[PDB]
Design a protein around this ligand. Structure first.
Ligand SMILES: O=c1[nH]c(=O)n([C@H]2C[C@H](O)[C@@H](COP(=O)(O)O)O2)cc1CO
Ligand SMILES: O=c1[nH]c(=O)n([C@H]2C[C@H](O)[C@@H](COP(=O)(O)O)O2)cc1CO
Ligand SMILES: [Mg+2]
Ligand SMILES: [Mg+2]
Lengths: 208, 208
């Protein structure tokens, strides 16, 4: 089974991933995890990160260019995803194809039914062959609370300064609204919306 | 030996490549050839082409985004280049790293000493590890004559319509001027400037 954890920056995805993986393991299932962007593992992922922190000229100014780098990152991990799925019972991902739809739609002030989300659909799933997730969990959180966690993370960790997207409070709010639409739409597969208080044991029972 | 054939669109590079490869073979050396962008062989190369023909939203509007896709294309062919160099005596390329410097510098109205050309240097050679060419041949031609060949190619071949760069006569002229600077500078390795009348036999003797 392939599970994707989605949400805005500072929503608390990586933590939910560690709590979830533990719950599945306390249930007897082997678990594997992968996080996108795969920093350090692919040039596409790295150039993208550097671009969000101000490098590579006008790269980050193009909404479609950024989406492409993130998609090229995933395209390079297809065999790896399939391998993990064959050998493990559960595979949890920290962000997946839906992040590209939500952020791209939000940067262009479009909704989940817009052209950007449809573009991601056509390129990543149909063309690049990334397998659709069995489940997509949306850790819904107030934009204010999320931004607060992102700002705190930057204050206490020099190698964790916020990037362009994280400094745009408006983009984070719109992205939140697009995510909520994607879920109700069942975009790319079935979704499950949870909050900060979601119980890891029950949650893992819903996804089992 | 690694040889790169550079020049503006319609300069006549592919033809010089077929005439050159024949001259080396008539000299007893095995020859191998590769052309960039590697259309059909890599997603990066294909998205780039589609973008130049009007697809993928605002992608082609970013100078650095296009340069990145072309570089990602090459990055994926490094092992292939090295393999060809080990097994063959001569390897001729239809366009290589210098095209990214010339076109990028020209789109930004910079010269060969500008930041764009320096960026390509840092990312493709130093970071991605593409081997520098032993020789870089610049097929210098009048911008007018080149554009004339590009327009004729489009009239007689439906699958050969000009792309964005080819329709910009001003970009083609500036790109020509940047190329001439790159050569005099010996950018990326030694250069050889030739014209339409260059003799394939002698030329191949200079590169032998
Ligand atoms: O496909 C994507 N599209 C996309 O826009 N992103 C965004 C989310 C962030 O602002 C950034 C990477 O974020 P992070 O390292 O916090 O997961 O890029 C991330 C991905 C996944 O790679
Ligand atoms: O690195 C590059 N940078 C770059 O700007 N180009 C340009 C030249 C063209 O206008 C186009 C591809 O051209 P062509 O198929 O005629 O070789 O992209 C081509 C390459 C090589 O890939
Ligand atoms: Mg982030
Ligand atoms: Mg061309």
């Amino acid at each position: 089974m392939l599970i994707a954890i989605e949400g805005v920056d500072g929503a608390g995805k990586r933590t939910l991933v560690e709590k979830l993986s533990g719950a599945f393991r306390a249930a007897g299932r082997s678990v594997a995890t992968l996080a996108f962007p795969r920093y350090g593992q692919s040039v596409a992922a790295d150039i993208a990160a550097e671009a969000l922190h101000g490098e590579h000229g006008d790269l980050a100014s193009s909404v479609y260019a950024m989406a492409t780098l993130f998609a090229l990152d995933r395209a390079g991990a297809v065999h790896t995803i399939q391998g993990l799925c064959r050998g493990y019972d559960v595979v949890i991902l920290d962000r997946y194809v839906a992040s590209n739809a939500a952020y791209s739609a939000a940067r262009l002030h479009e909704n989940a039914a817009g052209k950007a989300a449809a573009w991601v659909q056509r390129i990543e799933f149909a063309r690049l062959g990334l397998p659709k997730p069995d489940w997509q969990v949306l850790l819904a959180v107030s934009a204010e609370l999320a931004g607060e966690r992102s700002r705190g993370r930057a204050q206490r960790d020099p190698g964790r300064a916020r990037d362009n997207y994280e400094r745009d409070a408006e983009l984070q709010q719109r992205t939140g609204a697009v995510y909520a639409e994607l879920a109700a739409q069942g975009w790319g597969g079935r979704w499950l919306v949870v909050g900060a208080d979601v119980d890891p044991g029950r949650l893992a029972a819903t996804l089992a």
